[PDB]
Design an enzyme around this catalytic site. Structure first.
Site, short mmCIF file in Angstrom:
data_model
loop_
_atom_site.label_atom_id
_atom_site.label_comp_id
_atom_site.label_asym_id
_atom_site.label_seq_id
_atom_site.Cartn_x
_atom_site.Cartn_y
_atom_site.Cartn_z
N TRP A 162 -9.51 6.10 -0.58
CA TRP A 162 -9.90 6.67 -1.87
C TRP A 162 -8.97 6.11 -2.95
O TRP A 162 -7.92 5.56 -2.63
CB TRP A 162 -9.80 8.19 -1.86
N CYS B 206 0.79 -1.24 0.00
CA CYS B 206 0.00 0.00 0.00
C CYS B 206 0.82 1.29 0.00
O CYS B 206 1.59 1.54 0.93
CB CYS B 206 -0.97 0.03 1.17
N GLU C 222 -5.09 3.30 -10.70
CA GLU C 222 -5.84 2.06 -10.45
C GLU C 222 -6.99 1.92 -11.45
O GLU C 222 -7.27 0.82 -11.94
CB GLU C 222 -6.40 2.03 -9.03
N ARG D 205 -0.20 4.56 2.89
CA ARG D 205 -0.07 4.34 4.33
C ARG D 205 0.23 5.56 5.21
O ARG D 205 0.20 5.42 6.43
CB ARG D 205 0.95 3.23 4.61
#
Ligand code: HEM
Ligand code: HEM
Ligand SMILES: CNCCN(C)c1cccc(CCc2cc(C)cc(N)n2)c1
Ligand SMILES: CNCCN(C)c1cccc(CCc2cc(C)cc(N)n2)c1
Ligand SMILES: C[C@H](O)[C@H](O)[C@H]1CNc2nc(N)[nH]c(=O)c2N1
Ligand SMILES: C[C@H](O)[C@H](O)[C@H]1CNc2nc(N)[nH]c(=O)c2N1
Ligand SMILES: [Cl-]
Ligand SMILES: [Cl-]
Lengths: 362, 362
Positions: A237, A65, A242, A68
């Site tokens: 979000w 991720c 992506e 973070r």
């Protein structure tokens, strides 16, 4: 062996958690309490403080991720109290509503009761709470190919999709002691969607692209101090890539690059024209512009990377080891323009964390 | 311990080499020959056939290389005969000329005599045979920052650069038994350079960008059957992203993205405009177009990836294990548009291979 794994993980977690919370002195007494409770009951129950910080730690330790930096502001909703499918359903509806927050997205996790003997109390089938259905009938492809198997499973259970390219899957989950899962159609008023337009190319709307506002991962197990919360949906979000570089772009997803190339008025004939790269950039600009124009939170990969750099610095300052998965951290467009590309990361697994689990369909 | 490492590597290599060459029957006798030669001399001498296939195998085993489909057509030049700095110099000049081949680039390696007692016979200081100098004087930056240390070392030795952004470094190498390396200015007639223009944006020439035609890595050690060829420069042709997404783009290289953005008429003010991504694409289109317009070989990352897929298939068909470094194989732009991004690779080290070695400057 199981009670020993549990007691070991509990010791590691309580010490670290209470240390972070400035409650180191309370560790001995709480560990005793846990020790008796495991003996007597076969498990132990987290306090609200432990559960919240545990979910936060789990996000902080998620190697893949990039987002973070904000681990400590995760909104944790405690739903260990639920017992019925109506209550699970309403908790899922509520999660969507509060996380969406009219577009001003709040990173949120809802925590359902955990596994007992490795026996799930609630088993969520969705990959994300909001996702599009996928169909393949005789070489005819509709919707999101990644949803094909779940879509087929839902349609076993009596659901039927309209076979649009953007059918919302229903929520689908199974309760302990039921042989079949139940499903509920999502209220459209709960689901924010964003039509994809381009800031200067008017023709881009001819593609009729859209995406949902909030990605809510709902099939990962949260592990905190030996307790397995198999059902604990969470959201942030979107980072624009992506949607723009993967969901809409991959050949095995929506595969839109040839159509993007056409509407932006370039040929898709020669590799040396880099038409895929040019289309990727325009589609990604379009996604960012569209989310921003609608007032739905989103981050670009450059800003996200800058934020992640602050996470790295923040970790060293707090004296915490940093872990990361370089292959997932780099963005799928212009990765070499981020600092991430130019350093390496230790991919060790630290707990608490979120883990994959087996699909009950497939 | 050293003669044992040598004998072990020799056994592994000769068996595999002769197996590939359909000469399995000759293995026992050649190994005997090598066995006596190591005993008597402390080493052994490769046959021309062994050296050639060894260099080819080494390329095939180079995990970080996307261009490996053509491993078997490597042009191997045997210069184990050289004894003088004039001969090294002329061999380097010849390598440039024959590999350049008027723009129709030939993948070539020149092999100089190998280390004896770990004692180098020839020690090449250049990172590539053709590279640009780099300067930093009082925050003033000129040329290629990656060349700063070598440039400083050359200028110790009496060379002086014109302090243009594209000064060709001289060849610089040390002979066994000399305390200092010598240097020779490159004849400009040997060095093909390509001015960077854009296919539709005329203003792009205002940047006055250019790059050299042929990347000739000259500081890696080739290892074949325990023999250390520390001096063995090799070349392919460029993949465009190497120049467009790295050499000209990195902040610690030529750092041209802001200037690219300006000439292509977009603002470089907001991360959400993806101006870096758009500039990267246009600069990369420019590089490809410029090399092609000049008749200098180059490959785009899409074609390169397609070729690498054939290498993968070719390997399985020949029953060879495939190794690769995912982090180097993915291109630095649109990596998710290549098949490489979507699979994994075993990063094991197999020999023969090319290896890093310590810089004699720094
Ligand atoms: C706040 C905004 C957030 C952003 C922009 C963000 C960004 C990302 C991105 C880009 C990925 C890569 C996913 C992919 O390529 O499929 C990712 C993975 C992940 N994120 Fe985040 N994230 C955010 C919030 C969160 C939150 C709130 C959690 C959990 C509490 C979380 C946990 C994870 C996990 C577990 C993965 C890996 C999932 C997997 O292995 O498939 N993230 N994140
Ligand atoms: C024929 C055209 C070739 C192309 C297009 C090609 C492409 C590439 C690229 C893009 C890289 C990554 C380098 C970087 O990012 O700095 C690379 C690395 C490499 N290539 Fe190739 N290559 C070619 C020929 C060759 C040849 C002829 C050899 C040796 C005989 C070779 C051996 C290597 C090695 C050893 C590396 C890794 C170097 C390092 O670790 O720094 N390649 N190649
Ligand atoms: C290759 N298949 C990948 C499927 N997986 C494992 C997958 C698919 C979609 C999304 C994710 C995680 C994405 C994510 C999660 C959260 C909380 C926020 C965010 N911005 N992205 C993971
Ligand atoms: C991060 N610093 C990287 C410096 N290195 C190790 C480096 C620098 C420039 C080039 C290379 C290998 C590039 C290469 C070699 C060959 C034969 C062909 C080709 N197309 N590229 C490696
Ligand atoms: C540390 C990190 O792995 C490093 O930046 C790597 C990433 N992958 C790469 N890939 C290529 N082709 N070239 C490089 O220089 C690098 N650098
Ligand atoms: C096998 C390979 O590592 C795989 O394609 C990974 C690469 N890195 C990734 N990175 C992100 N963010 N998302 C992904 O789905 C993947 N897939
Ligand atoms: Cl997604
Ligand atoms: Cl280079």
């Amino acid at each position: 062996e199981e009670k020993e794994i549990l007691w070991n993980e509990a010791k590691a977690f309580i010490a670290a958690c209470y240390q972070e919370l400035g409650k180191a002195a309370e560790v001995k007494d709480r560990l005793a309490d846990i020790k008796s409770e495991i003996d007597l009951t076969g498990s132990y129950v987290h306090t609200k403080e432990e559960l919240e910080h545990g979910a936060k730690m789990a996000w902080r330790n998620s190697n893949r991720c990039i987002g973070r930096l904000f681990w400590n502001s995760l909104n944790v909703i405690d739903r260990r109290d639920v017992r019925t499918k109506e209550e699970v359903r309403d908790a899922l509806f509520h999660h969507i509503e509060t996380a969406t927050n009219n577009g001003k997205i709040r990173p949120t996790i809802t925590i359902f009761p955990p596994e007992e003997k490795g026996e799930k109390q609630v088993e969520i089938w969705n990959h994300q709470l909001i996702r599009y259905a996928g169909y393949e009938s005789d070489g005819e492809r509709i919707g999101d190919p990644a949803s094909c198997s779940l879509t087929a499973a839902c349609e076993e259970l009596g659901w039927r999709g309209e076979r649009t390219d953007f059918d919302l899957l229903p929520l689908i989950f199974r309760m302990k002691g039921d042989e079949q899962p139940v499903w509920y159609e999502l209220p459209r008023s709960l689901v924010i969607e964003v039509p994809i337009t381009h800031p200067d190319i008017e023709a881009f709307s001819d593609l009729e692209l859209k995406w949902y506002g909030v990605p809510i991962i709902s099939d990962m197990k949260l592990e905190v101090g030996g307790i397995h919360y198999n059902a604990a949906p969470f959201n942030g979000w979107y980072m624009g890539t992506e949607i723009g570089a993967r969901n809409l772009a991959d050949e095995k997803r929506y595969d839109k690059l040839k159509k993007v190339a056409s509407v932006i008025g370039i040929a898709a004939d020669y590799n040396t024209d880099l038409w895929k790269d040019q289309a990727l950039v325009e589609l990604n600009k379009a996604v960012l512009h569209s989310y921003k124009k609608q007032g739905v939170s989103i981050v670009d990969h450059h800003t996200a990377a800058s934020q992640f750099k602050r996470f790295e610095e923040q970790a060293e300052e707090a004296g915490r080891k940093l872990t990361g998965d370089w292959t997932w951290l780099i963005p799928p467009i212009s990765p070499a323009a981020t600092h991430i590309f130019h350093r390496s990361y230790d991919n060790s697994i630290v707990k608490p964390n979120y883990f994959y689990q087996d699909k009950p369909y497939e």
